[PDB]
Amino acid sequence: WQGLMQFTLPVRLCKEIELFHFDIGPFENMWPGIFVYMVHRSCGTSCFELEKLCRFIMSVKKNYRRVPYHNWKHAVTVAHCMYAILQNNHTLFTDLERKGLLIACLCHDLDHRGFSNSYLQKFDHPLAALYSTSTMEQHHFSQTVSILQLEGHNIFSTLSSSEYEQVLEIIRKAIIATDLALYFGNRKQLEEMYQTGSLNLNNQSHRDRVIGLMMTACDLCSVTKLWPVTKLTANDIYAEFWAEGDEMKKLGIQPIPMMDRDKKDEVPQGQLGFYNAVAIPCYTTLTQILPPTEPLLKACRDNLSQWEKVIRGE
Ligand SMILES: Cc1nc2c3ccccc3nc(SCc3nc4ccccc4[nH]3)n2n1
Numbered sequence: 001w002q003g004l005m006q007f008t009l010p011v012r013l014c015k016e017i018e019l020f021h022f023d024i025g026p027f028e029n030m031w032p033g034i035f036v037y038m039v040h041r042s043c044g045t046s047c048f049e050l051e052k053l054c055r056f057i058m059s060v061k062k063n064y065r066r067v068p069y070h071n072w073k074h075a076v077t078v079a080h081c082m083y084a085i086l087q088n089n090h091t092l093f094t095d096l097e098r099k100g101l102l103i104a105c106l107c108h109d110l111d112h113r114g115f116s117n118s119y120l121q122k123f124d125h126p127l128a129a130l131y132s133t134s135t136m137e138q139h140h141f142s143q144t145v146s147i148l149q150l151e152g153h154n155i156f157s158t159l160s161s162s163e164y165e166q167v168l169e170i171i172r173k174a175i176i177a178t179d180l181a182l183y184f185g186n187r188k189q190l191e192e193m194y195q196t197g198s199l200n201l202n203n204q205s206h207r208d209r210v211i212g213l214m215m216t217a218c219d220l221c222s223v224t225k226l227w228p229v230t231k232l233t234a235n236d237i238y239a240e241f242w243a244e245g246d247e248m249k250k251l252g253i254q255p256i257p258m259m260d261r262d263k264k265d266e267v268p269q270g271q272l273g274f275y276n277a278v279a280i281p282c283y284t285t286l287t288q289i290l291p292p293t294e295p296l297l298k299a300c301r302d303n304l305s306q307w308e309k310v311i312r313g314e
Pocket residue numbers: 180219220222223233234237258270271273274275277278
């Protein structure tokens with residue numbers, strides 16, 4: 001972290017980091033510094049102790065595993081998308097929420113092992129015994145708290161108890177909301193609330209639901225990057241799906257299709273289903289509630305039609 005304290009973002013990145021489509025991929029060595037930058041620009045220079053923050057960042061980094069998709073790179077990619085969301089909707093959120101949500105995005109897949117929640121449930125993994133729903137997402141939070149409580153890592157030490165436990169709740173909720181199994185209910189409710197005009201960000205329950213959708217929107221943002229970056233990040237995703245499907249084949253169990261590397265002809269069609277069923281819906285409702293996030297929906301549509309071109313060989 002010594003080098004991270006005296007790190008500085010190049011003036012070129014200062015312009016582009018603000019854009020939704022910005023792709024962090026090409027700047028691996030700057031990722032921790034990019035996150036520090038984003039926290040300062042959104043939450044200020046004065047709230048986090050530079051040293052404790054930098055140490056926390058590198059311990060978060062160290063506790064992400066080298067797996068195809070749910071890795072350090074993905075953590076920072078999800079943090080960035082949130083930054084741009086926060087930056088375009090700044091005063092709709094409180095200072096404590098932005099503190100908690102940026103950290104939550106960075107920490108939201110800590111210690112991911114490359115296995116889904118169903119895998120862990122089906123094979124009675126210890127973690128499935130402690131956590132019976134949103135198994136990994138509950139582990140990811142518990143992992144966040146564990147780092148926070150390390151010597152010198154408590155970046156929320158300068159908060160009151162009330163505020164500390166407030167930001168842990170923003171965080172816990174936000175990390176749990178990245179369990180995609182919860183998203184579908186969340187989105188349909190948010191859609192109904194918006195369509196009836198009942199939605200109210202001063203209503204806490206509503207407010208938690210918007211934040212949840214923001215986290216989903218952030219988790220999936222590889223579908224809002226430029227086509228070639230999107231393509232590339234799809235390799236990473238299915239690489240991890242197939243790795244897991246393989247582990248089932250070793251146990252003589254045919255995996256679901258998206259985790260079966262012998263069924264990869266079905267990928268183009270699988271992406272079509274995912275954009276129609278999951279991704280487009282997400283950014284559509286998000287754009288209704290936070291209009292300045294439309295470019296996410298715009299880029300998502302662009303990429304859907306790209307997967308449409310592929311299906312008919314073009
Ligand atoms: C680019 C991408 N990102 C994801 C993803 C991200 C988080 C959780 C699941 C994800 N699944 C996929 S593709 C497999 C899939 N196809 C579906 C169709 C309908 C509903 C869920 C689906 N998941 N993809 N594809």
